[PDB]
Amino acid sequence: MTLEKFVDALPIPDTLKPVQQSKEKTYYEVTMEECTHQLHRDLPPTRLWGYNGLFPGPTIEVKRNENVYVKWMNNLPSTHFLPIDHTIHQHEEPEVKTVVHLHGGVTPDDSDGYPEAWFSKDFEQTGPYFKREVYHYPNQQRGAILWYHDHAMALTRLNVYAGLVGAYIIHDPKEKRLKLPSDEYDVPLLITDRTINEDGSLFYPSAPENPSPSLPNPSIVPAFCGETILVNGKVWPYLEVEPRKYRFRVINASNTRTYNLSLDNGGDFIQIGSDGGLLPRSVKLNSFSLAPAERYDIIIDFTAYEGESIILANSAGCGGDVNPETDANIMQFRVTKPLAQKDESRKPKYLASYIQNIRTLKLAGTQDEYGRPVLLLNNKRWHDPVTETPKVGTTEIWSIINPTRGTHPIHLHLVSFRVLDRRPFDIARYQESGELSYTGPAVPPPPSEKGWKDTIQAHAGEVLRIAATFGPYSGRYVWHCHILEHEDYDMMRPMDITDPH
Ligand SMILES: [Cl-]
Ligand SMILES: [Cl-]
Ligand SMILES: [Cu+2]
Ligand SMILES: [Cu+2]
Ligand SMILES: [Cu+2]
Ligand SMILES: [Cu+2]
Numbered sequence: 001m002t003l004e005k006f007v008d009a010l011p012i013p014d015t016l017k018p019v020q021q022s023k024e025k026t027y028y029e030v031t032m033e034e035c036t037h038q039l040h041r042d043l044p045p046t047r048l049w050g051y052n053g054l055f056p057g058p059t060i061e062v063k064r065n066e067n068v069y070v071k072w073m074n075n076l077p078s079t080h081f082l083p084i085d086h087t088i089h090q091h092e093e094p095e096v097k098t099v100v101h102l103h104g105g106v107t108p109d110d111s112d113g114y115p116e117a118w119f120s121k122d123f124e125q126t127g128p129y130f131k132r133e134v135y136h137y138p139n140q141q142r143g144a145i146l147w148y149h150d151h152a153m154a155l156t157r158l159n160v161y162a163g164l165v166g167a168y169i170i171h172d173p174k175e176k177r178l179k180l181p182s183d184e185y186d187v188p189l190l191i192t193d194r195t196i197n198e199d200g201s202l203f204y205p206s207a208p209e210n211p212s213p214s215l216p217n218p219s220i221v222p223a224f225c226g227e228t229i230l231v232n233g234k235v236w237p238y239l240e241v242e243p244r245k246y247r248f249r250v251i252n253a254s255n256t257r258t259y260n261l262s263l264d265n266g267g268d269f270i271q272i273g274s275d276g277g278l279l280p281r282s283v284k285l286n287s288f289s290l291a292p293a294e295r296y297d298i299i300i301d302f303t304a305y306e307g308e309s310i311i312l313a314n315s316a317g318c319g320g321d322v323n324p325e326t327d328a329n330i331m332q333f334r335v336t337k338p339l340a341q342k343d344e345s346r347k348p349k350y351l352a353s354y355i356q357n358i359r360t361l362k363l364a365g366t367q368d369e370y371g372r373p374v375l376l377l378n379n380k381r382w383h384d385p386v387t388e389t390p391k392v393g394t395t396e397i398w399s400i401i402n403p404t405r406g407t408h409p410i411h412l413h414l415v416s417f418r419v420l421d422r423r424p425f426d427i428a429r430y431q432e433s434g435e436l437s438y439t440g441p442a443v444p445p446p447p448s449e450k451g452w453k454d455t456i457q458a459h460a461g462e463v464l465r466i467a468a469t470f471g472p473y474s475g476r477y478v479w480h481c482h483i484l485e486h487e488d489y490d491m492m493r494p495m496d497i498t499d500p501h
Contacts, residue, residue: 002227002228002325002326003040003042003043003196003228003235003236004040004041004042005236005325005329005332006236006237006238006309006331006332007040007041007238008040008041008234008235008236008237008238009234009237009238009239009240010231010232010234010237010238010239010331011232011233011234011237012187012188012232013054013056013057013058013059013166013167013188013232014058014059015058015059015060015061016028016030016052016058016059016060016061024067025067025068025069026062026066026067026068026069027069027070027071027134028060028068028069028070028071029070029071029073030051030052030057030058030070030071030072030073030100031051031052031053031073031074031075032049032050032051032072032073032074032075032076032098032164033049033050033051033052033053033075033076034047034048034049034053034075034076034077035047035048035049035050035053035054035055036048037050037054037055037233038200039194039196039200039230039233039234039235040196040228040234040235040236043196043200043235044199044200045200046196046200046201046202047081047201047202048162048163048202049076049159049162049163049164050163050164051072051148051164051166054166055163055165055233056163056165056166056167056190056232056233056253057148057164057165057166057167058166059166059167059168059169059188060148060166060167060168060169061168061169061171062137062139062168062169062170062171063139063170063171063172063173064139064140064141064142064143064170064171064172064173065138065139065140066139067138067139068136068137068138068139069134069135069136069137070100070134070135070137071133071134071135072098072099072100072135073122073123073133074096074098074119074120074121074122074123075121075122076096076098076121077096077121078094078095078096078120078121079095079096080095080096080155080158080162081162081202082158082161082162082202082204083158083204083205083206083218084155084158084218085216085218085219085220086216087216087219087370088154088220088488088489088490089153089154089382089490093125094120094121094124094125096120096121096155097118097119097120097127097152097153097155098118098119098120098150098152098159098164099113099114099115099117099118099119099127099150099151099152100113100135100148100149100150100151100164101113101148101149101150101151101413102135102137102146102147102148102168103146103147103148103149103293103411103454103455104144104145104146104147104275104276104295104416104454105137105139105141105146105168105414106138106139106140106141106414106472106473107135107136107137107413107414107473108136108138108473108475109473109474109475109476109477109497110131110132110136110475111132111135111136111137112413112414112477113135113151114129114151114476114477114478115127115151115152115153115154115156115478115492116128116129116153117129117130117131118130118152118153127153129476139170140472141170141277142170142172142276142277142278142452143169143170143171143172143175143277143278144169144170144273144275144276144277144278144295144297144452145167145169145188145249145251145273145275145295145297146167146168146169146170146295147165147166147167147168147190147251147253147293147295148165148166148167148168149164149165149166149253150164150165154488155488156484156487156488157220157224157255157484157485157487157488158204160253160255160484161194161202161204161224161255161484162202165190165192165253166190167188167190167249167251169188169249172277175278178346178348178351179344179345179346179348180247180272180299180345180346180347180348181244181245181246181247181299181345182247182345185242185244185245185246185247185345186246186247186249187239187246187247187248187249188232188248188249188251189231189232189248189249189250189251189331190231190232190233190251190253191229191230191231191250191251191252191253191254191259191290191330192226192229192230192231192233192253192254193225193226193227193228193229193230193254193255193257193318193327194226194227194228194229194230194235195226195227195228196227196228196235204224205221205224206218206219207219207221208220208221208222208372210371210372212370212371214369214370214371215370215371215372216370219370219372220372220485220488220489221485222372222373222375222485222486222489223256223318223319223483223485224255224256224257224484224485225256225257225318225319225320225327226254226255226257226318226327227326227327228326228327229314229326229327229329229330231330231331236329236330236331236332237331237332238309238331238332238333238334239331239332239333239334240334240336240337241302241333241334241335241336241337242302242335242337242338242339242340243302243303243304243305243306243335243339244301244302244303244339244343244345245299245300245301245302245303245343245345245346245347246299246300246302247272247297247298247299247345248297248298248299248300249295249297250290250295250296250297250298251295252290252291252292252293252294252295253292253293254292255292255483255484255485256292256318256483256484256485257292257316257318258289258290258291258292258316258318258407258409258457259289259290259314259316259330260287260288260289260290260314260315260316261287261288261290261312261313261314261330262286262287262312262313262315263300263310263311263312263313264310264311264313265305265308265310266286267300267301267304267305267310268284268285268286268301269284269285269286269288269296269298269299269300270282270283270284270285270298270299270300270301270347271283271285271288271296271297271298271447271448272297272298272299272351273295273296273297273298273351273451274295274296274297274448274449274451274452274453275293275294275295275416275452275453275454275455276416276417276451276452276453276454277352277416277451277452278297278351278352278451279351279352279447279448279450279451280350280351280352280353280354280450280451281349281350281351281447281450282347282348282349282350282351283446283447283448285298285448287315288448289316289457291407291409291455291457291482292409292455292482292483292484293409293411293454293455293482294409294455294457296448299347300333301347302333302335303343305335306335306336307335307336308334308335309332309333309334309335310332310333310334310335311329311330311331311332311333312329312330312331312332312333313328313329313330314327314328314329314330315328352451354451354452355395355396355397355467356391356394356395356396357390357394357395357396357397358396358397358399359388359390359396359397359398359399360398360399360401361377361378361398361399361400361401362377362378362379362401362403363375363376363377363400363401363402363403363404363408363410363458363481363491364376364379364403364404365404366379372489374489374490375404375408375481375486375489375490375491376490376491377479377480377481377491377492377493378493380493381490382490382492382493382494384493386493386494386495386496387493388479388493388494388495388496389495389496389497389498390470390495390497390498391470391497391498391499392470392471392473392474392497392498392499393469393470393471394469394470395467395468395469395470396467396468396470397420397465397466397467398465398466398467398468399463399464399465400458400463400464400465400466401425401430401436401463401464402458402459402460402461402462402463402464403427403430403431403461404460405460406460407457407458407459407460408457408458408481408483408486408491409455409456409457409458409481409482409483410455410456410457410458410464410479410480410481410482411454411455411456411479411480411481411482412454412468412477412479412495413477413478413479413495414470414473414477414497415454415468415469415470415471416452416453416454416468417452417453417454417456417466417467417468418452418453418466418467418468419445419449419450419453419456419464419465419466420444420445420465420466420467421442421443421444421445421464421465422442422443422459422462422463422464422465423438423440423441423442423443423462423463423465424438424439424440424461424462425437425438425439425461425462425463426438426439426461427460427461436463438463442465453466455482470497471497473497474497474498474499475496475497475499476494476495476496477494477495477496477497478492478493478494478495479492479493479495480492480493
């Protein structure tokens with residue numbers, strides 16, 4: 001028997017309060033705490049690692065150009081409760097390393113959360129790139145859905161699965177005149193798949209299928225597909241909504257899983273924004289794909305559906321087809337709250353208006369000495385000399401070629417980018433020869449991808465082209481696959497945005 005669906009109200013994480021706020025600076029403190037929270041009516045409390053002891057973390061709301069500082073502290077225990085594989089990466093390091101990355105942040109390099117800028121409990125020990133306790137987020141960027149999460153070297157999949165995710169919204173007051181649904185009718189949805197034991201403890205696997213005798217125990221796995229789906233820290237919740245327009249900030253905070261969402265009454269979503277902010281023009285959607293770290297700013301118009309119960313449904317597989325009783329379900333909207341006031345919100349169609357190098361990038365896997373797949377960007381390891389070195393201020397086109405069997409959601413820190421096109425190629429030939437020979441025309445982005453993206457699905461047997469301008473800041477960043485199981489082994493590379501000064 002699987003946990004009974006739709007019997008816990010969707011929590012709405014509280015908005016973090018500043019420690020200090022003047023007209024020209026905002027200081028926040030966030031402490032990583034081991035904590036316990038009940039993930040379903042019928043479970044005992046689950047041991048979790050959460051920002052301020054909460055899962056998800058507090059929702060952080062800033063205005064565009066708000067000068068924000070965050071002191072992210074580690075008060076976690078010194079050993080992990082999830083299985084650590086020592087083989088993937090005065091010389092014995094602490095087992096628990098944390099660093100916070102603001103995903104989608106236009107962030108100076110020393111506050112971006114470099115994987116090797118980790119710290120242990122109370123900053124007692126720190127990685128090689130550690131420089132500062134208090135991170136600076138000048139927020140000089142378009143309003144959008146951001147999120148924040150752990151990024152420590154070789155531990156990212158574990159620390160995130162343990163609960164260290166939160167939302168961060170940048171409000172651009174020049175967008176207020178669109179009258180998009182707001183306040184109580186603006187709601188974040190952080191989607192996390194989890195596998196939960198009978199006693200409420202989290203399960204994370206300590207070995208993959210691969211039965212080979214040489215396998216380190218524990219071993220990293222190439223993918224994690226959870227049995228149960230959570231939204232805002234509750235398993236298959238319901239939200240009571242009013243019969244009107246709502247805004248939802250949908251964030252995929254899962255380790256590996258891709259969702260493909262729809263509404264079981266047949267209703268439509270209106271996509272208004274992507275990772276990088278508002279789309280140039282809205283889009284009526286009946287379904288959409290959402291890979292790890294992707295965000296979809298959307299409206300749902302519950303006006304025509306008073307009294308109905310509507311399932312937010314999932315059709316994407318993860319390690320097999322979806323099971324209709326379990327991972328085919330996300331959550332349930334109940335249109336049964338009395339309209340508290342007239343629906344003065346709007347759903348405009350029109351929302352906004354917007355080549356020094358080419359770089360070719362290969363996504364491929366090799367095999368380690370134990371027979372495990374190691375996933376790699378351009379056949380380089382994390383610790384190899386940096387090769388992606390655009391000059392600050394310059395625009396490049398990245399051609400990302402994927403001959404592997406699966407989609408990889410590729411994310412670049414600091415920037416958002418334009419999607420140019422995707423084009424299919426003959427893997428067979430490309431494999432055998434190195435020859436990039438196409439099989440059909442180039443496909444331009446749908447409307448969903450006509451704005452700005454920071455995390456982008458590079459599909460099997462396609463070459464993906466995107467255009468990024470590498471600024472405004474310079475320095476040491478990263479880019480990587482955002483399936484955390486891939487990132488940690490070893491599909492992540494440093495990215496130097498070079499500065500003549
Ligand atoms: Cl509103
Ligand atoms: Cl999909
Ligand atoms: Cu991220
Ligand atoms: Cu990021
Ligand atoms: Cu990947
Ligand atoms: Cu990253």
